[PDB]
Design a protein around this motif. Structure first.
Motif, short mmCIF file in Angstrom:
data_model
loop_
_atom_site.label_atom_id
_atom_site.label_comp_id
_atom_site.label_asym_id
_atom_site.label_seq_id
_atom_site.Cartn_x
_atom_site.Cartn_y
_atom_site.Cartn_z
N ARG A 73 4.14 16.46 -9.55
CA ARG A 73 5.59 16.40 -9.48
C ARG A 73 6.06 14.98 -9.74
O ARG A 73 5.29 14.03 -9.61
N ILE A 74 7.33 14.84 -10.11
CA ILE A 74 7.92 13.54 -10.40
C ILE A 74 8.81 13.07 -9.25
O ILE A 74 9.63 13.82 -8.72
N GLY A 75 8.63 11.81 -8.85
CA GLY A 75 9.43 11.27 -7.78
C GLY A 75 9.87 9.87 -8.13
O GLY A 75 9.51 9.36 -9.18
N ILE A 76 10.64 9.26 -7.24
CA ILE A 76 11.13 7.92 -7.48
C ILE A 76 10.84 7.04 -6.27
O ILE A 76 11.09 7.43 -5.13
N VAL A 77 10.29 5.86 -6.52
CA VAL A 77 9.98 4.95 -5.44
C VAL A 77 11.29 4.40 -4.90
O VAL A 77 12.09 3.85 -5.67
N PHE A 84 1.70 17.33 -5.11
CA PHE A 84 2.58 18.14 -4.28
C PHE A 84 1.92 19.51 -4.20
O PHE A 84 1.64 20.13 -5.22
N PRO A 139 0.73 -1.27 0.00
CA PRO A 139 0.00 0.00 0.00
C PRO A 139 0.77 1.33 0.00
O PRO A 139 0.39 2.26 -0.71
N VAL A 140 1.82 1.44 0.81
CA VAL A 140 2.56 2.69 0.87
C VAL A 140 3.85 2.77 0.05
O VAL A 140 4.72 1.90 0.12
N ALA A 141 3.97 3.83 -0.73
CA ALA A 141 5.15 4.06 -1.53
C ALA A 141 5.94 5.14 -0.82
O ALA A 141 5.39 6.18 -0.50
N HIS A 142 7.21 4.87 -0.55
CA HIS A 142 8.09 5.87 0.09
C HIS A 142 8.82 6.52 -1.07
O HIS A 142 9.72 5.94 -1.68
N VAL A 143 8.41 7.73 -1.38
CA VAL A 143 8.95 8.41 -2.55
C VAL A 143 9.97 9.50 -2.27
O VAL A 143 9.86 10.25 -1.30
N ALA A 144 10.96 9.57 -3.15
CA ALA A 144 11.98 10.59 -3.01
C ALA A 144 11.63 11.71 -3.95
O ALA A 144 11.32 11.49 -5.12
N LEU A 145 11.65 12.92 -3.41
CA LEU A 145 11.37 14.09 -4.21
C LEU A 145 12.60 14.97 -4.16
O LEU A 145 13.42 14.86 -3.24
N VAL A 175 7.29 7.99 -10.46
CA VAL A 175 5.86 8.15 -10.32
C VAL A 175 5.55 9.62 -10.32
O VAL A 175 6.43 10.44 -10.06
N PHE A 221 8.86 10.62 1.23
CA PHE A 221 7.48 11.08 1.28
C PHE A 221 6.54 9.92 1.01
O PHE A 221 6.69 9.21 0.01
N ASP A 222 5.57 9.74 1.91
CA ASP A 222 4.61 8.65 1.83
C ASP A 222 3.38 8.93 0.99
O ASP A 222 2.69 9.92 1.16
N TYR A 223 3.10 8.01 0.07
CA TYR A 223 1.97 8.12 -0.81
C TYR A 223 1.21 6.81 -0.83
O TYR A 223 1.78 5.74 -0.61
N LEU A 224 -0.09 6.88 -1.10
CA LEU A 224 -0.90 5.68 -1.14
C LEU A 224 -1.00 5.16 -2.55
O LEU A 224 -1.05 5.93 -3.49
N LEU A 225 -0.97 3.84 -2.68
CA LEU A 225 -1.11 3.19 -3.98
C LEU A 225 -2.54 2.67 -4.05
O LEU A 225 -2.94 1.80 -3.26
N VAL A 247 -0.71 7.98 -5.33
CA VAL A 247 0.19 8.16 -6.46
C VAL A 247 -0.74 8.35 -7.64
O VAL A 247 -1.73 7.64 -7.77
N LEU A 272 -3.09 9.40 3.42
CA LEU A 272 -2.05 9.51 2.41
C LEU A 272 -2.60 9.91 1.04
O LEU A 272 -3.62 9.40 0.60
N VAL A 329 3.22 12.36 -8.53
CA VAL A 329 2.51 12.41 -7.26
C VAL A 329 2.04 13.82 -6.98
O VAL A 329 2.56 14.78 -7.55
#
Lengths: 104, 105
Positions: B42-46, B36, A2-8, B32, B16-20, B63, B60, B34
């Motif tokens: 914005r573009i981020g990386i899992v 912001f 469920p949770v994606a830990h994303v880097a911005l 992904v 940063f936490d996001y819900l799938l 995505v 949350l 997401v």
């Protein structure tokens, strides 16, 4: 899962907001105790003292106590630590907290 | 008086936490889109995916889209990127998005 830990490619000063109490005056460079999520207290360092918040000043996690009346970091050291975090790409928080010990 | 911006010691890579949403899937190393800001993209990386977050799942933001079927980076390159960010204390996002142009180009 469920949770994606994303880097911005987030900003430079990524800090947290807490409502300063009445009659309780504190400035940057001073350690303060603030609640941390679903739980109790935890020490931190004031970087800025604005009058605006990203979220409502109603549902904003308040503060607790001011452990310092006078900044533990000098205008000198402060200028230097913030410069190092920016120039060498280190999170302000990490540089500030890892510096405090060596200072004392 | 109001807000005092405080810095707090945080876990290794501050992410940063996001819900799938149901049906959506992603693996580490994938980009992904997401939300912001109250209304931006914005573009981020899992970096990783787990079954937990500080906040409850329903709080949350979700995505919006996955831009990579598979990782954009090579496996080794990927493990080294996460390593360097931890070892030299650099924001993982800073490292990942600066190296992308260098590596793919």
């Amino acid at each position: 899962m469920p949770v994606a830990h994303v880097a911005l490619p987030v900003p430079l000063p990524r800090t947290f907001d807490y409502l300063l109490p009445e009659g309780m005056t504190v400035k940057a460079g001073c350690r303060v105790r603030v609640p941390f999520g679903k739980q109790q207290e935890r020490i931190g360092i004031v970087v800025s003292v604005s009058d605006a918040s990203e979220l409502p000043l109603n549902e904003l996690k308040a503060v607790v106590e001011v452990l310092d009346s006078e900044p533990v970091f000098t205008h000198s050291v402060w200028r230097l630590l913030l410069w190092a975090a920016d120039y060498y790409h280190h999170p302000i928080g990490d540089v500030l907290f890892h510096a405090l010990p060596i200072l004392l």
